[PDB]
Amino acid sequence: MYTAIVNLKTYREATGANFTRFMEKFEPVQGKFELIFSPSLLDLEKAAKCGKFRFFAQHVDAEPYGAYTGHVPMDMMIDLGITGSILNHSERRLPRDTIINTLKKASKLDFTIVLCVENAEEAKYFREYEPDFIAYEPRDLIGGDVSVSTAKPEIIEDIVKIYEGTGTSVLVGAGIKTGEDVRRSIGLGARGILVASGVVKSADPTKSLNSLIE
Amino acid sequence: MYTAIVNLKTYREATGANFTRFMEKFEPVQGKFELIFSPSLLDLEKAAKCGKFRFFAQHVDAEPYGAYTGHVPMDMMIDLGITGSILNHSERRLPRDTIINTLKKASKLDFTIVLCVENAEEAKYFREYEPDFIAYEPRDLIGGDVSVSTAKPEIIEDIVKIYEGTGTSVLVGAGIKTGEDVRRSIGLGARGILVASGVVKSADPTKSLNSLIE
Ligand SMILES: O=P(O)(O)OC[C@H](O)CO
Ligand SMILES: O=P(O)(O)OC[C@H](O)CO
Ligand SMILES: [Cl-]
Ligand SMILES: [Cl-]
């Protein structure tokens, strides 16, 4: 019933040659949390070939197969077995029309979009386009040791309210380190979490993740 | 002494599961042309693993390993064994400050950049940043049946002149189909070519490519 997304970003520990050995340490989970990992674009085909976990891309382009140098098309991901993507992350922000065009395309194709937003106004703006997930991550907290649930509890509540009774699930991220941060987020109405450094940069990633989702 | 770049873009025939099958049909070449292929970003780590040809990325980001969701870092490429990239293709245009920052970074790391431009004034703009290659491709001819050497011979000459006596080699592309197009491009001063549809969409890609570089 809840979702946990582990965003590997482009961290040295979980990308390139390290991707396989980093993942090797995790085991599937049964619990309240559906587990999703987000590998770097260069690692995504490798990830998809295994399929030991559910994998989402970090970013996706709406352009079809064809003359699109330097793109990562949604149709190509689908063919590789990738069933979703993060979009508009604070580190990979996009114009609004691009986002809308991509959501429109994904809605036809049973491809899941996790749309990141930086505030409640952006969250509202995108509501009518019916993203599958909204991921609230305040830009300045990302990578830090202060939880979004600690720092922005009222904004979390506002975004949840915005999406109440829609098919969109609200996730929250930035600075999530402990089980307590996760409980607090669920307590404020969120349906799950995104995490990167708290897991990827840990002395024991597998154990850190288990702390969050237990 | 010359360079030929085969840009696979995101063409169905040469991406995904088709990448390996597509490449399997080519053999190294001995001749005046150094042969480089440019696979799609999702196929790049696969391509790098093999290394039967020299492979360049279709695009590259300057950001280091770290918190850069949805990026394709130069350092990650270098660790996978990729030694260069196309940059600022007409299909993947970038702001000038991003380009400059990327060149500056590549110039420190012995990573080769093939900088695309759309006209002579843009070619001049970039001259002081010393790109390893300049690739003149007029935007409106890309994918068409009219060669850059047929349609823009004076602009080719102008760009070559701009870079004369620098360490930068000038390549040309757009609508290159025949050995004649190639001879004509070299004849106007170019040091090589970029080609996509003429090879990728051919009945016999291997023979089409051999026609160009013989
Ligand atoms: O603050 P972090 O390191 O958990 O990173 C959060 C990510 O931006 C989630 O996508
Ligand atoms: O006209 P094409 O299909 O050879 O395309 C040329 C490419 O833009 C070279 O990168
Ligand atoms: Cl790192
Ligand atoms: Cl195609």
Curated annotation (Swiss-Prot), chains A, B:
Where is this protein found?
A: Cytoplasm
**What terms describe the molecular function in GO for this protein?**
triose-phosphate isomerase activity
**Pathway field:** Carbohydrate biosynthesis; gluconeogenesis; Carbohydrate degradation; glycolysis; D-glyceraldehyde 3-phosphate from glycerone phosphate: step 1/1
Enzyme Commission code(s) on record: 5.3.1.1
Q: Cross-referenced InterPro entries, in alphabetical order?
A: Aldolase_TIM (IPR013785), TIM_sf (IPR035990), Triosephosphate_isomerase (IPR000652), Triosephosphate_isomerase_arc (IPR022891)
Q: Which reaction does it catalyse?
A: D-glyceraldehyde 3-phosphate = dihydroxyacetone phosphate
Extract the NCBIfam families matched here: PRK04302.1 (NF003302)
State what protein this is by name.
Triosephosphate isomerase
Organism in which the protein naturally occurs: Thermoplasma acidophilum (strain ATCC 25905 / DSM 1728 / JCM 9062 / NBRC 15155 / AMRC-C165)
**Originating gene:** tpiA
